[PDB]
Every structure is written in structure tokens, then in C-alpha cells.
Design an enzyme around this catalytic site. Structure first.
Site: not given
Ligand SMILES: *[C@@H]1O[C@H](CO)[C@@H](O)[C@H](O)[C@H]1NC(C)=O
Length: 355
Positions: A300, A146, A254
Site C-alpha cells: 500500500h 491513497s 493493494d
């Protein structure tokens, strides 16, 4: 609970609240591979939203409550059953406590309520590890998920330059950017930047860079120039400027990309076409990225999840693709490194995470 905390010896390198930054380390003696993983967790970009993050996400802004150990999971696991790729490596988890996508170089001061030191935290961690065995390394893989994945893109070449200038030109620096390859695309529904929730990432990052004193890689900075450095936070724009080998892992759909596009999930035509176009655009940006793993799933992050081995693209898992990448850096028969799904809808790959 197998990685041990070390707070940085240079206590001017701090988390947001001025507490010392640090890293968790599990050494593997006799291994010359080092994995330095950058935690993610969004970012904050003004006083008000950083204050709120301090109330309810304080571990992302401070080391005062960090535990003395953490368990390595996924690519940070030392068990081959869980980590077929790099189970015997020296493992480092660098907590994200700077809220600046690992870009900042500013101290807490008279003029700054918070310190944003992400770029300096990475440098200081590398410097202190050199004396704990990293000086003997053959490969330093800087990985992250991330905001930590974007942090890899922003910092991998600076780590390479740092080691070269310190006299370690034999250490091969490489990057592994997981779930950090975002698009500055139009949102599905559109909000002007009037507060935190309405502010799209291009505008939030433009503000963040000024608030953080954010830094970006030199070649990308020279392309986009003053006031446009926010462009370098978008993987498809910064990646072509990098010299270090970088492997890009990115779900085609995502969940964080959908969030910043104002999508949250019977899907009618406009949204169907929006989602299909997002996957197509993501796939297009990866066309010429030779080391990539991009499954057609709504999810994710991947690399520190314990079941990270389960997903496959074209029959190849991510640990296998990473191993093939290592071999490629020594095409290979049956050992691919470019793995991008072509099917156009989330979970059209049957190996996607179940949730
Ligand atoms: C501590 O870190 C600061 C900020 O990155 C740097 O300027 C300084 O040289 C470091 N000091 C030591 C003793 O390493």
C-alpha cells in the site's frame, strides 16, 4: 527536517475543524520543476465517524498540532541517492486535513460541524505558491498517495484550468496517482451499509459527496450526472475523461482494496480465485493506461517511502519509469513507461516490499 510549514494566508480555507490548512515547502532555486504531493489517509463521511476520527486521527482534521517542519522522503527527498527522479525539484507536501478525498468545497457553519475543503485547499496552495516561485515553473507534478492519489485524479485538470485562467498557460500540469486506483468490485464477503465498517466505498463515497459538497472533474460529472458523481472517484472511470498526463502507480493487490473487499490474510479455492481475479481486473483496467507502474505485490503506497527505489517491474524501477515518462513528454529504447506485472499472485515479483 527540510520542508517548512506555511499556514494558508487565506484563513477561510480550513481543515475540518476550521483551523487553517497549509503546506510544507522546500524551494530549489533555479529549478523550474514543482512537486505538490497530496497526503492520504482514508476519509470520513458522517458526523459519527468524523467525530471518531477527530479523537484519534486529529492531525488528519486539524492543523493545530502540526510540526513546523517535515522531512522529505522518497519522491519528496532532495538527495539523489534516495530520489533518482526529482531530487532537485521544488518540494511541496500538502497535509490531508479535509477527510474528503480532496473533493470538498464546504465551510464549517451553522449547518456544518466540519469544513470539507480539500478541492479549495489545493487551489489555494497553488495560488499562494505562484508568488513564491511557482510562476516560473515549467512542470507542476501533482502527486499523492491513497486518498491523495485519488485526489490527483479528481483535481489535476482543475489545477491546469486554474493556471490557464490565471495567465500561466506555459506551466505543464501533470498527475502522479499512487495507490488511488480502486475498483468498485464485489466484496469477498458482503455487508449492507449499516454503519461505517459495513459500508462499501461506493456507498460511503455517495454519502460523502453529499456531506462534503464534493466536486468531481467536469467531463466526468457531465457523463455520470446528478447523483452518480461517486463514479468519478474510481480511477478507471475518471481517468479517460482527463486531459492532463497522469502516471498511475498501483499495486495489483493493494491492501486498502483488499480491506474494502473484506479480505484480510492457508488460502482455499474461493479466496484464491477472488485474489487472482482482483489482480486480473486491475491489470485489465490499466491495459490502455500508457504511463503506469503496477507490481504484483500485497502492499500500500510507494512514492514517499524511503525505499521506493527498490521495486522493479520487468527490471525497471519506478524512479526510472518516471524519468522515462518525463522524456516521453519532451516509445523510447530501453526506457519504458507502461509497466504492469502479469504474474497472478502477491509477491510473484521478487522485488516486492518485504514488510
Ligand atoms: C479565500 O478562499 C475562498 C474559498 O476558496 C475564496 O472564495 C476567496 O476568494 C479567497 N480569498 C482571498 C482573499 O484569496
Amino acid at each position: 527536517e527540510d520542508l517548512r510549514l506555511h499556514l494558508l494566508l487565506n484563513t477561510s480555507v480550513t481543515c475540518n475543524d476550521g483551523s487553517p490548512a497549509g503546506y510544507y515547502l522546500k524551494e530549489s532555486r533555479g529549478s523550474r520543476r514543482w512537486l505538490l504531493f497530496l497526503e492520504g489517509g482514508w476519509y470520513c463521511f458522517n458526523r459519527e465517524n468524523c467525530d471518531s476520527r477527530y479523537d484519534t486521527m486529529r492531525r488528519l482534521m486539524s492543523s493545530r498540532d502540526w510540526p513546523r517542519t517535515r522531512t522529505g522522503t522518497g519522491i519528496l527527498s532532495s538527495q539523489p541517492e534516495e530520489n533518482p527522479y526529482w531530487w532537485n525539484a521544488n518540494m511541496v507536501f500538502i497535509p490531508y486535513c479535509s477527510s474528503d478525498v480532496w473533493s470538498g468545497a464546504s465551510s464549517k457553519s451553522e449547518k456544518n460541524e466540519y469544513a470539507f475543503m480539500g478541492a479549495l485547499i489545493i487551489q489555494e496552495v497553488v495560488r499562494e505558491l505562484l508568488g513564491r516561485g511557482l510562476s516560473g515553473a515549467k512542470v507542476l507534478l501533482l502527486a499523492g498517495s491513497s486518498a491523495g492519489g485519488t485526489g490527483v485524479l479528481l483535481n489535476v485538470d482543475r489545477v491546469a484550468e486554474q493556471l490557464e485562467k490565471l495567465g500561466y498557460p506555459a506551466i505543464q500540469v501533470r498527475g502522479l496517482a499512487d495507490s488511488g486506483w480502486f475498483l468498485d468490485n464485489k466484496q469477498y464477503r458482503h455487508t449492507d451499509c449499516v454503519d461505517t465498517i459495513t459500508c462499501a466505498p461506493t456507498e460511503a463515497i455517495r454519502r460523502g459527496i453529499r456531506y462534503w459538497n464534493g466536486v468531481v472533474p467536469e467531463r466526468c460529472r457531465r457523463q455520470f450526472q446528478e447523483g452518480e458523481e461517486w463514479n468519478c472517484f474510481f480511477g478507471y472511470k475518471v481517468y479517460p475523461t482527463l486531459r492532463s498526463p497522469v502516471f498511475v502507480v498501483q499495486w495489483l493487490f493493494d491492501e486498502a482494496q483488499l480491506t474494502v473487499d473484506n479480505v484480510h490474510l492457508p488460502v482455499q479455492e474461493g479466496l484464491r480465485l477472488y485474489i487472482q481475479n482482483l489482480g486480473r481486473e486491475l491489470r485489465h483496467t490499466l491495459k490502455d493506461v500508457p504511463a503506469s507502474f503496477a507490481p504484483a505485490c500485497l502492499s500500500h503506497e510507494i512514492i514517499i517511502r524511503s525505499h521506493w527505489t527498490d521495486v522493479q517491474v520487468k527490471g525497471t524501477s519506478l524512479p526510472r519509469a518516471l524519468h522515462c515518462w518525463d522524456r516521453s513528454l519532451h516509445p523510447l529504447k530501453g526506457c519504458p513507461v507502461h509497466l504492469v506485472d502479469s504474474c497472478p499472485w502477491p509477491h510473484c515479483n521478487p522485488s516486492c516490499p518485504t514488510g
